[PDB]
């Protein structure tokens, strides 16, 4: 996978290209104001050492940070999300696993519409890297979910516990 990351909007400024989860971008620039995705999936992220706020990019290109749903234009760590074959989880609807549940596979662009219940609050990833978002549509806050537990929204790095979308991460061609 390869991105790069420019202080000023438009594709501008001091640049840096980069090809592999890095725990700390300050080091070559303070701010990001656009970026190029080459190829890949990837989570950025606000704060350090993957922290703060989280956004979702894929293949192409972002002239201004809103492009990306950022809240800023502070960037300072980021993943590169490997190849999911498979998407599968589980949603329930309290805290550690209680309450009903449903599993899917496919995604979700209103949680609330869609199942026998309207209430979530825990997950349990089988299969593949998702993100998860705090409104309906794919908007808001967003939360990347890798393989595993996550019991409470604590677990998912929220700060909060609103809930309204499910994306798989799988490739933009």
């Known amino acids: 996978g390869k991105i790069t990351f420019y202080e000023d909007r438009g594709f501008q400024g001091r640049h840096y290209e980069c090809s592999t989860d ?5 080091p070559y ?15 950025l992220y606000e704060q350090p050492n993957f922290t703060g706020c989280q956004y979702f990019l894929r293949r192409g290109d972002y002239p201004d940070y809103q492009q990306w749903m950022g809240f800023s234009d502070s960037v300072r760590s980021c993943r590169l999300i490997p190849h999911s074959s498979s998407h599968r989880i589980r949603i329930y609807e309290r805290e550690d696993y209680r309450g009903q549940m449903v599993e899917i596979t496919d ?53 909060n516990a609103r809930v309204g979308s499910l994306r798989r991460i799988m490739d933009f061609y």
Request: with cysteine.
């Open 22 to 26: 890095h725990s700390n971008l300050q």
């Open 29 to 43: 620039f303070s701010r990001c104001n656009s970026v190029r995705v080459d190829s890949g999936c990837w989570m």
């Open 107 to 159: 995604d979700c662009p209103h949680l609330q519409d869609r199942f026998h219940f309207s209430d979530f609050h825990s997950f349990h990833v089988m299969e593949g890297y998702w993100v998860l978002y705090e409104m309906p549509n794919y908007r808001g806050r967003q939360y990347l979910l890798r393989p595993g537990e996550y019991r409470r929204y604590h677990d998912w790095g929220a700060m």
